[PDB]
Design a protein around this ligand. Structure first.
Ligand SMILES: OC[C@H]1O[C@H](O[C@H]2[C@H](O)[C@@H](O)[C@@H](O)O[C@@H]2CO)[C@H](O)[C@@H](O)[C@@H]1O
Ligand SMILES: [Zn+2]
Lengths: 164, 368
């Protein structure tokens, strides 16, 4: 598990390829979106889509994405929660590559994201993503958007009703 | 709601909560403190959600696998039983409740699924799983069915799944390696493929749950079920002449062994009242006795009363199954395991996924 920071600048650099998608943002059980909130939805949805048909180390992986407002700065952070061939030695590079390659098409300047992997106090990578999802991310209601391919959270992750 | 000077005790609905209440009334008697005993649904998920800030209970009862999570999130008070008391209980039982050097709950009893058969409908219960299809066809002829047990909770399915080599986390040098899951090895894939095929071949129905199979067996519409000790009170009431025996082999079935434990909410004011109730009213010969008489506990962690319970052929059948299974880990990753193999089991029985897909998934889930 980790986090990617998304500065306010990244949203300023958005282009029309980013904004003009009809993709189904199902807000029937959610809260409405603001233009930059909707930008994060569309990004998460499209990173998810590209992940689904991405090979190499990321083949066959399970993922949980969640984008929130930064509470004390402008901008957003994305929560990212594994798979075979996904290990501590390639995890950062593979997660940065996935997200930068989708975003490259959506911004008017060169912008790169950085992935900060959740570590223990004893310097070890965290390997609790699932109880993280279960005990933290699904309890937020403060949560802008969320996409996942993990069975059982596929429907509930964009339920306001459930999280409540 | 919790209050200073009163005890609130949660405990699951299949166990002898009434008999525990009788122990709380004896406690109320001797001290003036009212005990109340409550059996909510899903209490192993309700407690972590409300213990810190909401209305948690004073004392919480469950198998020892969930406490590692609780004590990591710090929802749990220390326990302080002295050497004199520690000696009254079995060394292995105190091990199941020891987490990061510290005892984090009061052990109570040892649980393990067994095979429960209807002697009238089946005088020689099958020793092997593979005999079960043939036995279900010879029993569908007579108007019955060979076997029905709860297929929703992975607790029941697992024994078959670990039989040929499935496991949760690789236990090596006293330490569970959470990097090393074995839910997708050959031996697990075989265990589960056998279970799905029993559903394809109409020998079991993927929709069967705890309520449905307890009714089929307690009414005599099936010859066999899989269940733990708590289940014998209602079978006694139904007059079925039953027997409790070793679980079928596959290709022994290793069940995961539970130690029913009591923990103490960090949000209790009555941490010393709880400690007195458990050490001096419940984990006594009479106290355990009062609970066992409502719904059996299995093999109690108190030596002095386990010595009488084990003369019961059923309790030796349960310890037999326990010796072939494994003590559940307690580490916090165990809720992520149980999440992963519950999903795979329900998706492969219902057809939503193949055995190979649904196990490739629950291989990644528990150690992201
Ligand atoms: O179903 C997975 C389940 O396994 C264990 O739950 C058992 C428990 O040991 C028994 O006391 C009994 O009442 O039935 C339960 C099955 O629902 C684990 O304790 C639990 O964490 C896990 O979810
Ligand atoms: Zn956050």
């Amino acid at each position: 598990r980790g986090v990617l920071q998304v500065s306010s600048n990244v949203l300023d650099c958005a282009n029309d390829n980013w904004w003009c998608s009809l993709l189904d943002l199902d807000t029937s059980d959610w809260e409405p979106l603001t233009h930059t909130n909707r930008l994060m939805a569309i990004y998460l949805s499209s990173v998810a889509s590209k992940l689904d048909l991405t090979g190499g180390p990321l083949a066959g992986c399970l993922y949980f994405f969640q984008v929130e407002c930064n509470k004390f700065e402008e901008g957003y952070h994305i929560h990212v929660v594994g798979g075979p061939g996904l290990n501590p030695r390639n995890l950062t590079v593979c997660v940065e590559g996935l997200f930068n390659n989708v975003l490259y098409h959506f911004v008017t300047e060169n912008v790169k994201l950085k992935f900060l992997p959740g570590m223990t106090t004893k310097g070890k990578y965290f390997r609790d993503g699932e109880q993280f999802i279960e005990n933290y991310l699904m309890k937020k209601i403060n949560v802008v958007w969320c996409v996942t391919n993990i069975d059982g959270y596929i429907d509930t992750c964009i339920s306001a009703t459930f999280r409540r | 709601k919790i209050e200073e000077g009163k005890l609130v005790i949660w405990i699951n609905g299949d166990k002898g909560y009434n008999g525990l209440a009788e122990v709380g009334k004896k406690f109320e008697k001797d001290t003036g403190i009212k005990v109340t005993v409550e059996h909510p649904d899903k209490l192993e998920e309700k407690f972590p959600q409300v213990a810190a800030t909401g209305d948690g209970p004073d004392i919480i009862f469950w198998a020892h696998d969930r406490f590692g999570g609780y004590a990591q999130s710090g929802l749990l008070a220390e326990i302080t039983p002295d050497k004199a008391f520690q000696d009254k209980l079995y060394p292995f039982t105190w091990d199941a409740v020891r987490y990061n050097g510290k005892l984090i709950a009061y052990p109570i009893a040892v649980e393990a699924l067994s095979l429960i058969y209807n002697k009238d409908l089946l005088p020689n219960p099958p020793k092997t799983w593979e005999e079960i299809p043939a036995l279900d066809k010879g029993l569908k002829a007579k108007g019955k069915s060979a076997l029905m047990f709860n297929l929703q909770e992975p607790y029941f399915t697992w024994p078959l799944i670990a039989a040929d080599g499935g496991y949760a986390f690789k236990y090596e040098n006293g330490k569970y390696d959470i990097k090393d899951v074995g839910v997708d090895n050959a031996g697990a894939k075989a265990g589960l493929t056998f279970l799905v095929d029993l559903i394809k071949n109409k020998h079991m129905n993927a929709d069967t749950d705890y309520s449905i199979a307890e009714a089929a067996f307690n009414k005599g519409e099936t010859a066999m079920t899989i269940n733990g000790p708590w289940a014998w009170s209602n079978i006694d009431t139904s007059k079925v002449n039953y027997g409790v025996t070793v679980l079928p082999t596959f290709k022994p079935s290793k069940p995961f062994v539970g130690v029913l434990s009591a923990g103490i909410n960090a949000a209790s004011p009555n941490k010393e009242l709880a400690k007195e109730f458990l050490e001096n009213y419940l984990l006594t010969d009479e106290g355990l006795e009062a609970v066992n008489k409502d719904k059996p506990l299995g093999a109690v962690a108190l030596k002095s009363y386990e010595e009488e319970l084990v003369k019961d052929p059923r309790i030796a059948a349960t310890m037999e199954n326990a010796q072939k299974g494994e003590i559940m880990p307690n580490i916090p990753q165990m809720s992520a395991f149980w999440y992963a193999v519950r999903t795979a089991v329900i998706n492969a029985a219902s057809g939503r996924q193949t055995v190979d897909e649904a196990l490739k998934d629950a291989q990644t889930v528990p150690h992201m």
